[PDB]
Design an enzyme around this catalytic site. Structure first.
Site, PDB file in Angstrom:
ATOM      1  N   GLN B 105      -8.851  11.316  -4.989  1.00 39.80           N
ATOM      2  CA  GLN B 105      -8.349  10.180  -4.235  1.00 39.80           C
ATOM      3  C   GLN B 105      -6.886  10.384  -3.863  1.00 39.80           C
ATOM      4  O   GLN B 105      -6.135  11.054  -4.579  1.00 39.80           O
ATOM      5  CB  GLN B 105      -8.501   8.887  -5.036  1.00 39.80           C
ATOM      6  CG  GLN B 105      -9.899   8.296  -5.006  1.00 39.80           C
ATOM      7  CD  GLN B 105     -10.019   7.042  -5.848  1.00 39.80           C
ATOM      8  OE1 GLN B 105     -10.056   5.929  -5.323  1.00 39.80           O
ATOM      9  NE2 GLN B 105     -10.078   7.215  -7.162  1.00 39.80           N
ATOM     10  N   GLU B 106      -6.502   9.790  -2.726  1.00 40.88           N
ATOM     11  CA  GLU B 106      -5.138   9.797  -2.181  1.00 40.88           C
ATOM     12  C   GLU B 106      -4.625  11.222  -1.957  1.00 40.88           C
ATOM     13  O   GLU B 106      -3.623  11.649  -2.539  1.00 40.88           O
ATOM     14  CB  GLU B 106      -4.179   8.992  -3.069  1.00 40.88           C
ATOM     15  N   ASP B 107      -5.363  11.951  -1.107  1.00 37.50           N
ATOM     16  CA  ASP B 107      -5.019  13.300  -0.635  1.00 37.50           C
ATOM     17  C   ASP B 107      -4.907  14.299  -1.788  1.00 37.50           C
ATOM     18  O   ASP B 107      -3.922  15.028  -1.919  1.00 37.50           O
ATOM     19  CB  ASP B 107      -3.740  13.283   0.210  1.00 37.50           C
ATOM     20  CG  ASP B 107      -3.818  12.305   1.366  1.00 37.50           C
ATOM     21  OD1 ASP B 107      -4.885  11.682   1.548  1.00 37.50           O
ATOM     22  OD2 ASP B 107      -2.810  12.151   2.087  1.00 37.50           O
ATOM     23  N   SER B 108      -5.934  14.327  -2.630  1.00 38.22           N
ATOM     24  CA  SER B 108      -6.002  15.229  -3.772  1.00 38.22           C
ATOM     25  C   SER B 108      -7.183  16.181  -3.600  1.00 38.22           C
ATOM     26  O   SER B 108      -8.058  15.978  -2.756  1.00 38.22           O
ATOM     27  CB  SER B 108      -6.110  14.442  -5.081  1.00 38.22           C
ATOM     28  OG  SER B 108      -6.188  15.315  -6.194  1.00 38.22           O
TER      29      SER B 108
ATOM     30  N   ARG D  28      -5.000  11.688   8.973  1.00 41.86           N
ATOM     31  CA  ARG D  28      -4.171  12.846   9.291  1.00 41.86           C
ATOM     32  C   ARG D  28      -4.461  13.355  10.697  1.00 41.86           C
ATOM     33  O   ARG D  28      -3.615  14.024  11.304  1.00 41.86           O
ATOM     34  CB  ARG D  28      -4.395  13.953   8.263  1.00 41.86           C
ATOM     35  CG  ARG D  28      -3.814  13.661   6.891  1.00 41.86           C
ATOM     36  CD  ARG D  28      -3.340  14.937   6.218  1.00 41.86           C
ATOM     37  NE  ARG D  28      -2.390  14.672   5.143  1.00 41.86           N
ATOM     38  CZ  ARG D  28      -2.681  14.760   3.850  1.00 41.86           C
ATOM     39  NH1 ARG D  28      -3.902  15.106   3.466  1.00 41.86           N
ATOM     40  NH2 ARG D  28      -1.752  14.500   2.940  1.00 41.86           N
TER      41      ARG D  28
END
Ligand SMILES: [Mg+2]
Ligand SMILES: [Zn+2]
Lengths: 119, 123, 187, 227, 77, 62, 759, 199
Positions: B105-108, D28
């Site tokens: 989660q959250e760009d992981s 993005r």
């Protein structure tokens, strides 16, 4: 000069547009052929200012290698390359600090784009 | 060029309008304008990969090198006429988009334990 | 002769006809009205009034807060500052309560006039209220012209503010300190 | 770092070694990574049957269309859009939705984990302001800034802010005479009769250096003490 | 008189609990004899629940005057 | 060689302040029309063909 | 030895001649050794004469006077005689001597640096008879009073010494995601917890536990502070409970708890402050911890909402409605929830089905407690006795909106909300793992196999040619076109409908009609963005995350699929983009890129162009240049100081306003009254003693740090600059442009069309 | 154009009586509520001077009166305003209002320095009060408190005379009621209360 006044009147009338600095038709660069010569042109005057001051004292009232001190350009160019200081292209008593950048060797792609840039 | 007989000049290739760190990225026009600018001069400058072939004469701090570097599967035209396979750093990985127990989660990124012990991404 | 006016006034630049749904200064007893937006370049409202002999003066007011206060009192200044802040914060993205909007209007209009958001407007606010605390005024501007000019008059600073009390090891006035005492009474 | 058996496995035997979040795609705004993953998959998988008519260029300004990748990946046994039916690793049952897969090209950066850890356990002391030093090689300590102090002011905690800027920070003492208002150094005032009744206060070194600078600038201080 | 509030604020409770736990950490005789709980935060909580602390709140008015408030008359939710 | 078209604050009788042609050559501030007669043409009617542009005469002839 | 005491008032005064020689008379006449060891430590291995002389511990500084026979006036008093001159005895000693008050007004003595902060050591070695003139002896001390640290060093000395101090017992590490922990719980690895010491006093039970290991290690049960730089709002300083776990030198916490921190897991670090005293430990779990500040007081609603995966899972569970999971995979998901299983709503859905299968919306009833009543009229959801019963096309009651179930659960009991959102994540993640969310190529294609992409292309190419004729109609609202909009026959009407390049060229220059050519395209593009619902199935992974509001919206899908749209910047110069941007449109006179026009002052341009190629078909080299011109404004980083200098000057204007015991607010300096009654909407008088201005300044700081800084071209400046111009009230920069208001409230409304005739 | 001047002087005479009615100075209906043509058809239209000096006393008392002065010529100095200062000391009043057309002179400003201690003499221009200031929507209604009510307010909120929010004397509302330094004013909000002390 008549054409220079005519070109001014044609730009004041609104026909000929003014030349802007944000283009590459009116902007050239210098890569160690017109940039390295300025530090030699400045330091040769510093050497001639010392040679004349040394010859003014030793003649009023033959060490030719002593009258021509070679410790000015060797200690000037290394000092300019270390701290990154240079000479102004238009002014005289000014110093820029953007000509020298330290090369990186983390990967061979960084050293390929560090050699091709434009300030 | 073949259909109109009005042209007097032509470009060599449309891919030769970018830098050497940007004209080798695949699908450089499909990406966002602030997402190839965030990679052409911000990620390739600090990506580990190939290094100097003579590590006995060059002595400098922070000289990292990957064990098994890999050229990519694709072959861009800016990487064929250059005849150089050193400007591609990193290894390949078969990725998969999946919600994996909320751990990415959250760009992981969640990774494999049985793949980092076989030689992948070791430096 | 080519710059002399032939229609209208002389100091008015341009006027616009806008249409807003929820304007400032409501009618207080329908629909949404349309109003003119006059833009000037002596005074501001004391020279725009006797130039128009078509008086339809209802609730007309200048748009600038520094002029609206000095024309119609600090109450109308606060009432137009709240209405100008509740649109800017609502257009900023969030939705704040009025509890945090009215306090700024009551704290920036203490001395009867709106002060600036700097140290030159803070010293002029702390010197009218008879509270000579020159320590915090030195932590915002340069400390050169704040301790030399204060020692030449003989001011007596006090541990009143939070920064003025935390710097000397003491606690601030509010919170869990210096507001009540825990003492064993004999009774 | 999950183990190999727990990942969603495919029928052929491939295991996804990197699983990214699908929520990062419409924010993005990076398309073409799913196109790179579909162009690198059609050139690595074998054709059943033509190993010459396939496109593997991926030129930046001469990109092949979707109708050329979705018809080249179809001629080898996989689906057109690149996704394939995956199973479960923990339970073992089938999933109701397919999962897109492809061999992308990921790079590893410089910023590791061990190069950013930094703690402080009362190591060396800076000789000027008596503060912890901001050295990553030696013992460090993160600065308690202005907004980080205002956030504890707004929470109403004034007894936690007392040990933060005085006790855990530089802590020194300061003596001062009662009748006379001039401090000197135990307690010994040359303006007053020495050692009659001298009190000491608790002032941090950051404010005691301010008194030393003001006395060297030309401004004295006359402060009184309670009890 | 008493022109202040009747309920105990959290900013006074957070100091009363710390001041009480400081005594129990320095071996104070517990006058509630609660068993099972041993941590100085749980002992002070059960002592505030039984309202048997010898503490009084001497609040400070901003004008300059003051008025006290015993813990037996102060209530807290 | 900086040919400037600006107002004549110097050598004015405090009323005539309009656009004049001044040239900045080696810090001299000489007028351009006297530099025209300094060399070459020696004729005022034959000095407009060097500045011939065939434009509308609105405020440049003044 | 000395008793302890507290200071209460700082007094400033000018140091007189008696004020210097009264203290520290040590080595006054010594010009050969002006850095003597009796007053400081000159050498690195020196010794004080009259101290204990340890390593900067006993000696706190020793001053000294400099006896000067010459009399010099101080520069602070030299400006008084320059203003105390008049054309006129007794009058020369009264108005000129008030603040000195008949003093000597001369610098006889001079203090010396105590050799602890001395650049400055070898300067005072020659003022024993320096010169004869009274100017070289004044400049020699004027340079010494100017080379000090309190001279603009300056504010950088203040904000690094007195305002911001570094503290010990801290740690700084990068953070990663871990949804296995609780809400108010973090994770410290063993390598950090085996070195951080926390002091705690001895007790009667663990007398054999501490002596066999005061200074113990960071075990469980303790609490530490958490912080992310920079501090945005008040809720960015949560103190959570520690829990050790074996990890390779990295900390981890719940990814749903990163909403007050306003940070992601792309490399952000977390500051950690550890307390040591009991008075700093009990106060952390009473006013600072996560179970206390559950109300976001900047907005007045819930603080911990749903994250990214949980929001999408709670959407899909209630919208999918066509999955019938049996009793085998239902009792496994009943372990993460603390409530029992509902009865099965479906006994037999088919003759080929035997087991009673559950309902997807019945699975969401394992989180609401029995007795929960909730009704939302905009989504038609009714929750009766702990079981929701209806759902029809809604997603607003799940995220941070006006009325949602998180706020209604916080208003119900407020005791187990952190045990409800935790089970609403650790069950919804296991449910979403059984389905799988993936973005494939068919999600970017947004179309069928054949001819549906061609219909979409032929409709985009016709919807981008009507939004141009809509914008061309709006440019006829110029006062020079008043003769064209009348009901009369015209002859030059064909010249205004045939010229299509001229109307595009007029949109670039003269940016006063280009503000109605952007808002018209933004209103004609609403009928173009609505094509993403007729095309594509409902199971598309972009329409799931767009309708639920998790990541993105419908604007971030039409650029992926159909077309990017329009591109306008703030201000550019000497180039502008034309219409029909292709390879053939690269000529000099007929395009505004190279030459303006042929007939002409067009030096400054404001560009505006529309691209018909999407992010899937591929961009042209000119369309990838327009996207680099327009998106260059969002690449700078020299703007973050502007929300940092605003909230620093806005801070102390409200940071001293608190709540007194009299029921009204106060001012900490002079006990003044800001207002007589706090403007509280709630009727509960619980706000007493707290600094209500220190939580109102951060309430405006949070609306300025997260300000949408995408500026309008030339009419509106910025949503942050418009906030700063309202906040800067007394900053009278000038009287250049003042705007008035003239409301048309009169007797004109009784007549027909009175307002248009009056205006 | 004498009609525009007669209308501009009608607006001043219409807003002055409305200001004094809000101050409560016993205004009869002969002067208040006057139409646009009544000032011509009733008063002398052939009077090209400032002949509008109106005598008026208070309502609850008749000792202290009020002078509405109207000087004829502009730029009033000390050589011309001697009779404008002698009448208030000859008939022994303590309040007077004079209006001006143009800006004042400093020689006239040095006359009210030592004279404002006994007889209060304030000035405001007639070029600004073309409209009513109290009739605006943005400003609420005010109530000037008496010393018998100011004493019981400072002892209830236990606030001193300097710990109150300040309002300047040069404000167009504190100068609208003729307030001096020392008195407080009650200000209501559209339903809370907030008092203000005049600095
Ligand atoms: Mg981040
Ligand atoms: Zn010493």
């Amino acid at each position: 000069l008549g054409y220079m006044v005519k070109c001014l009147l044609n730009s004041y009338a609104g026909k000929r547009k003014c030349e802007n600095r944000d283009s590459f038709r009116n902007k050239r660069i210098e890569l160690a052929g017109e940039l390295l010569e300025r530090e030699i042109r400045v330091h040769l005057a510093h050497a001639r200012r010392k040679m004349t001051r040394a010859m003014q004292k030793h003649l009023s009232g033959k060490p030719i290698e002593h009258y021509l001190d070679a410790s000015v350009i060797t200690n000037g160019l290394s000092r300019a390359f270390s701290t990154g200081a240079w000479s102004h292209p238009f002014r005289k008593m000014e110093r820029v600090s953007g000509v020298v950048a330290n090369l990186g060797r983390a990967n061979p792609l960084q050293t390929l784009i560090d050699l091709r840039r434009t300030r | 060029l073949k259909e109109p007989k009005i042209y007097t000049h032509c470009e060599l290739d449309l891919s030769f309008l970018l830098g050497v760190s940007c004209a080798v990225v695949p699908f450089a026009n499909h990406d966002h304008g602030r997402r190839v600018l965030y990679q052409s001069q911000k990620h390739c400058q600090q990506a580990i990969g190939f290094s100097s072939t003579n590590p006995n004469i060059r002595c400098d701090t922070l000289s990292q090198q990957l064990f098994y570097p890999q050229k990519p599967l694709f072959k861009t035209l800016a990487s064929e006429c250059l005849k150089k396979e050193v400007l591609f750093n990193g290894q390949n990985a078969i990725v998969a988009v999946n919600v994996h127990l909320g751990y990415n989660q959250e760009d992981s990124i969640v990774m494999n334990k049985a793949s980092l012990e076989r030689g992948m991404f070791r430096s | 002769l080519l710059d002399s006016p032939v229609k209208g006034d002389q100091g008015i630049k341009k006027v616009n006809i806008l249409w807003t749904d929820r304007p400032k200064a409501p009618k207080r007893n329908l629909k949404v009205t349309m109003y003119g937006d006059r833009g000037k370049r002596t005074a501001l409202l004391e020279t725009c009034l006797p130039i128009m002999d078509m008086i339809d003066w209802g609730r007309s007011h200048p748009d600038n807060i520094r002029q609206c206060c000095s024309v119609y009192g600090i109450d109308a200044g606060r009432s137009i500052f709240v209405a100008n802040l509740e649109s800017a914060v609502s257009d900023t993205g969030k939705e704040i309560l009025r509890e945090h909007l009215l306090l700024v209007a009551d704290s920036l209009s203490v001395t009867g006039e709106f002060v600036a958001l700097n140290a030159k407007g803070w010293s002029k606010q702390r010197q009218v209220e008879s509270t000579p605390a020159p320590f915090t005024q030195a932590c915002f501007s340069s400390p050169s012209q704040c301790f030399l000019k204060a020692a030449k008059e003989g001011v007596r600073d006090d541990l009143q503010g939070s920064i003025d009390a935390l710097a000397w090891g003491k606690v601030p006035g509010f919170g869990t300190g210096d507001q009540f005492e825990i003492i064993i009474s004999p009774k | 770092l999950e183990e190999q058996q727990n990942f969603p496995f495919t029928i052929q035997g491939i295991v996804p070694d990197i699983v990214i979040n699908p929520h990062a795609f419409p924010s993005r705004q990076t398309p073409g990574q799913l196109l790179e993953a579909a162009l690198s998959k059609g050139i690595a998988c074998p054709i059943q049957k033509a190993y010459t008519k396939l496109t593997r260029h991926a030129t930046p300004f001469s990109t092949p269309g979707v109708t050329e990748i979705t018809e080249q990946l179809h001629r080898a046994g996989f689906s057109r859009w690149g996704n394939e039916r995956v199973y479960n690793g923990r339970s073992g049952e089938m999933m109701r939705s397919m999962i897109f897969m492809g061999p992308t090209f990921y790079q590893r950066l410089v910023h590791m984990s061990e190069d950013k850890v930094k703690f402080r356990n009362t190591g060396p002391v800076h000789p000027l302001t008596r503060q912890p030093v901001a050295d990553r090689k030696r013992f460090g300590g993160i600065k308690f800034g202005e907004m980080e102090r205002d956030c504890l002011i707004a929470h109403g905690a004034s007894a936690n802010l007392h040990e933060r800027l005085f006790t855990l920070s530089d802590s020194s003492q300061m003596h001062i005479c009662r009748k006379c208002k001039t401090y000197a150094n135990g307690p010994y005032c040359r303006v007053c009769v020495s050692s009659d009744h001298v009190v000491r206060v608790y002032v941090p070194y950051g404010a005691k250096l301010l008194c030393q600078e003001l006395f060297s600038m030309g401004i004295t201080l006359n402060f009184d003490t309670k009890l | 008189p008493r022109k202040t509030s009747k309920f105990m604020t959290k900013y006074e409770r957070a100091r009363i609990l710390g001041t009480r736990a400081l005594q129990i950490s320095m071996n104070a005789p517990v006058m509630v004899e609660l068993e099972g709980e041993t941590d100085p935060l749980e002992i002070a909580m059960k002592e505030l629940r039984q309202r048997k602390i010898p503490f009084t709140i001497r609040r400070y008015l901003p004008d300059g005057s003051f008025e006290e408030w015993g813990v037996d008359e102060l209530i807290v939710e | 060689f900086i040919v400037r078209l600006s107002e004549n604050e110097k050598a004015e009788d405090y009323k005539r302040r309009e656009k004049v042609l001044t040239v900045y050559f080696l810090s001299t501030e000489i007028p351009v029309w006297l530099l025209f007669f300094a060399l070459g043409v020696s004729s005022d009617k034959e000095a407009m063909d060097l500045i011939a542009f065939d434009g509308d005469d609105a405020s440049i002839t003044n | 030895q000395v008793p302890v005491g507290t200071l209460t008032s700082i007094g400033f005064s000018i140091s007189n001649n008696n004020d210097r020689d009264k203290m520290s008379v040590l080595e006054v006449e010594a010009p050969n050794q002006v850095t003597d060891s009796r007053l400081g430590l000159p050498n690195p291995d020196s010794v004080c004469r009259t101290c204990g002389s340890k390593d900067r511990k006993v000696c706190e500084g020793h001053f000294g006077v400099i006896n000067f026979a010459y009399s010099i006036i101080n520069p602070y008093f030299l400006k008084e005689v320059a203003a105390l001159l008049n054309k006129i005895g007794i009058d020369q000693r009264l108005i000129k001597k008030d603040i000195p008050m008949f003093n000597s007004l001369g610098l006889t003595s001079f203090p010396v640096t105590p050799n602890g902060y001395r650049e400055r050591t070898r300067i005072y070695k020659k003022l024993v008879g320096f010169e004869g003139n009274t100017l070289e002896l004044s400049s020699r001390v004027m340079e010494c009073m100017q080379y000090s640290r309190l001279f603009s060093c300056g504010l950088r000395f203040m904000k690094d010494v007195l305002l911001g101090k570094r503290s010990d017992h801290t740690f700084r590490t990068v953070v990663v995601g871990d949804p296995s922990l609780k809400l108010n719980e973090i994770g410290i690895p063993e390598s950090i917890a085996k070195r951080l010491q926390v002091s705690e006093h001895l007790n009667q039970c663990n007398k054999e536990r501490l002596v066999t290991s005061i200074f113990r290690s960071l075990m469980d049960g303790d609490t530490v502070l958490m912080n992310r730089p920079p501090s945005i709002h008040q809720h960015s300083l949560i103190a959570m409970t520690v829990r050790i776990l074996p990890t390779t030198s990295v900390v981890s916490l719940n990814p749903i708890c990163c909403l007050p921190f306003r940070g992601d897991f792309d490399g952000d670090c977390l500051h950690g402050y550890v307390p040591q005293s009991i008075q700093a430990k009990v106060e952390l779990d009473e006013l600072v911890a996560l179970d206390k500040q559950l109300i976001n007081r900047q907005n007045g609603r819930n603080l911990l909402s749903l994250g990214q995966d949980s929001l999408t899972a709670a959407y899909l569970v209630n919208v999918e409605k066509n999955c019938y999971l049996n009793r085998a995979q239902m009792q496994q998901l009943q372990m993460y929830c603390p409530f029992q299983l509902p009865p099965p709503a479906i006994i037999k859905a088919s003759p080929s089905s035997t087991e009673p299968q559950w309902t997807g919306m019945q699975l969401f009833g394992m989180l609401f407690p029995p007795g929960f009543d909730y009704t939302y009229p905009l989504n038609n959801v009714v929750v009766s006795n702990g079981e929701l019963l209806s759902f029809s096309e809604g997603s607003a009651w799940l995220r941070d909106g006006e009325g949602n179930f998180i706020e209604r659960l916080l208003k119900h009991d407020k005791g187990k909300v952190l045990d409800i959102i935790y089970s609403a994540q650790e069950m919804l993640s296991q449910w979403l793992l059984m389905r799988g969310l993936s973005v494939s190529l068919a999600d970017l294609y947004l179309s069928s196999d054949l001819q549906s992409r061609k219909n979409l292309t032929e409709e985009i190419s016709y919807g981008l040619r009507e939004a141009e004729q809509v914008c061309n109609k709006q440019q006829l609202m110029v006062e020079s076109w008043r003769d064209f909009l009348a009901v009369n026959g015209e002859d030059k009407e064909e010249d205004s409908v045939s010229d299509l390049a001229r109307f595009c060229y007029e949109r670039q220059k003269s940016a006063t009609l280009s503000e109605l050519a952007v808002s018209a395209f933004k209103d004609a593009y609403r009928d173009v963005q609505a094509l993403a619902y007729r095309y594509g199935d409902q199971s598309n992974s972009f329409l799931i995350m767009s309708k639920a509001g998790s990541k993105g919206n419908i604007g971030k899908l039409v650029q992926h699929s159909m077309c990017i749209g329009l591109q306008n910047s703030a201000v550019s110069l000497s180039f502008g983009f034309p219409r029909e941007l292709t390879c053939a449109a690269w000529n000099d006179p007929n395009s505004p890129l190279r030459g303006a026009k042929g007939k002409t002052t067009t030096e400054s341009y404001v560009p505006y162009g529309v691209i018909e190629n999407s992010f899937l078909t591929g961009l042209n080299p000119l369309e990838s240049f327009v996207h680099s011109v327009t998106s260059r404004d969002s690449s700078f980083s020299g703007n973050a100081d502007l929300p940092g200098t605003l909230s620093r000057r806005l801070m102390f204007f409200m940071r001293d306003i608190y709540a007194a015991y009299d029921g009204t607010v106060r001012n900490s300096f002079g006990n003044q009254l800001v207002q007589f009654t706090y403007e509280t909407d709630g009727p509960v008088e619980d706000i007493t003693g707290e600094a209500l201005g220190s939580l109102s300044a951060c309430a405006l700081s949070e609306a300025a740090y997260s300000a949408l800084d995408q500026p309008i071209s030339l009419l509106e400046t910025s949503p942050l600059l418009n906030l700063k111009n309202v906040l800067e009230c007394g900053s009278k920069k000038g009287q250049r442009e003042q705007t008035m208001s003239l409301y048309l409230s009169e007797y004109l409304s009784k007549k027909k069309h009175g307002f248009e005739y009056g205006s | 154009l004498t009609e525009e001047e007669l209308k501009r002087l009608y607006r001043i005479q219409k807003t002055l009586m409305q200001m004094l009615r809000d101050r409560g100075y016993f205004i009869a209906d002969s002067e208040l509520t006057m139409t646009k043509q009544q000032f011509i058809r009733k008063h002398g239209d052939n009077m090209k001077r400032e002949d509008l000096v109106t005598l008026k006393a208070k309502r609850n008392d008749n000792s202290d009166q009020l002078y509405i002065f109207f000087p004829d010529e502009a730029k009033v100095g000390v050589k011309t305003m001697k009779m404008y200062t002698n009448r208030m000391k000859s008939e022994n009043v303590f309040r007077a209002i004079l209006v001006v057309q143009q800006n004042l002179t400093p020689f006239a400003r040095t006359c009210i320095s030592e004279i404002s201690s006994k007889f209060h003499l304030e000035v405001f221009q007639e070029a600004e009060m073309l409209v009513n200031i109290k009739e605006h929507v943005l400003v609420p209604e005010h109530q000037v408190l008496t010393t018998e009510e100011k004493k019981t307010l400072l002892e209830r909120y236990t606030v001193k005379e300097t710990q109150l929010p300040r309002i300047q004397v040069t404000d167009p509302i504190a100068r609208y009621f003729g307030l001096k330094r020392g008195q407080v004013v009650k200000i209501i909000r559209p339903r809370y209360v907030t008092y203000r002390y005049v600095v």
